Amino acid sequence: EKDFLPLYFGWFLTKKSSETLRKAGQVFLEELGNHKAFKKELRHFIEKLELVSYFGKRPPGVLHCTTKFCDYGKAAGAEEYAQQEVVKRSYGKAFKLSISALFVTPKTAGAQVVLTDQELQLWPSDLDKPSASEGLPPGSQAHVTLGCAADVQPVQTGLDLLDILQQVKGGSQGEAVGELPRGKLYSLGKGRWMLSLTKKMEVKAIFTGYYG
Ligand SMILES: Nc1ncnc2c1ncn2[C@@H]1O[C@H](CO)[C@@H](O)[C@H]1OP(=O)(O)O
Ligand SMILES: [Cl-]
């Protein structure tokens, strides 16, 4: 009989790295909601809005950077991803993930992950809406979800990041609207915001499979 697959594969941050990022994420949301530029534009996003409340679904376990959602084999391309030599070799192995930005949209809040070439070997080739189908390099939408609005799915986060990076690719980033302690704040319109970190945040994570 066939072995079924994980619910998903990905890099699971260590306890310390997950907590560090979770805290940084929450501080960004607090700082962003307090920011004059954010308060000004509040009409294109949805007394002040507490974004920690707004993103009212948060990952309950450790934070992670998903590679391939498999749904135990039920997802397209799951078996082909899982049988890869590099996935088997990397299973249980520790990696460093670099985070270059934090972002918010009306649907999601996340961290942008900039994968190394080694790590891109674990990035699936068969994603719906791959980076390449928008002229972005593969794995450009790698992320760690920090929170979701109530009616949103965690998947949305990668789509939101791709849309943000499409825009930044058009150079439509705009002058920074603010200088937060850990970087420059950009208003991308339509309720989309990016904090571009002065120093990339490195987190430690283990590549493996989650079954729930
Ligand atoms: N097509 C899909 N359907 C469900 N979850 C997906 C998915 N693609 C990626 N994921 C990720 O798999 C995990 C379980 O649902 C979530 O963390 C989720 O989003 P995330 O990577 O943005 O957090
Ligand atoms: Cl891709």
Author numbering: 161 to 206, 213 to 378
How does the study describe this entry?
The catalytic domain enables the rapid hydrolysis of nucleoside 2′,3′-cyclic phosphates to nucleoside 2′-phosphates. The CNPase catalytic site, lying in a groove between two lobes, has pseudo two-fold symmetry and contains two apposing His-X-Thr-X (X denotes a hydrophobic residue) motifs, characteristic for 2H phosphoesterases 113537.
In the vicinity of the bound nucleotide and the catalytic core, the side chain of Arg307 can swing towards and away from the active site and, therefore, could play a role in the catalytic cycle. Also, similarly to V321A, R307Q presents an elevated KM, while kcat remains at the wild-type enzyme level. While Arg307 can be assumed to mainly affect ligand binding affinity, its mode of action is not entirely clear, as Arg307 makes no direct interactions with active site ligands in crystal structures. In the substrate complex, Arg307 is positioned towards the active site, like in the wild-type CNPcat apo structure, whereas in R307Q, Gln307 is turned away – quite similarly to Arg307 in P296G complexed with 2′-AMP (see next paragraph), and notably, in the sulphate complex determined earlier, where wild-type CNPcat coordinates a sulphate ion at the nearby anion binding pocket. In all structures, the 2.8-Å hydrogen bond between His230 Nδ1 and the carbonyl O of residue 307 is retained, which results in a ~1 Å retraction of the main chain at position 307 in the sulphate complex and R307Q. During catalysis, the β5-α7 loop opens to expose the N terminus of helix α7 and to provide space for the product, which still remains locked in a very similar orientation as the original substrate. This loop opening might be modulated by the conformation of Arg307, since our R307Q structure demonstrates that in the absence of Arg307, the loop apparently has a much higher degree of freedom and adopts a mixed open/closed conformation.
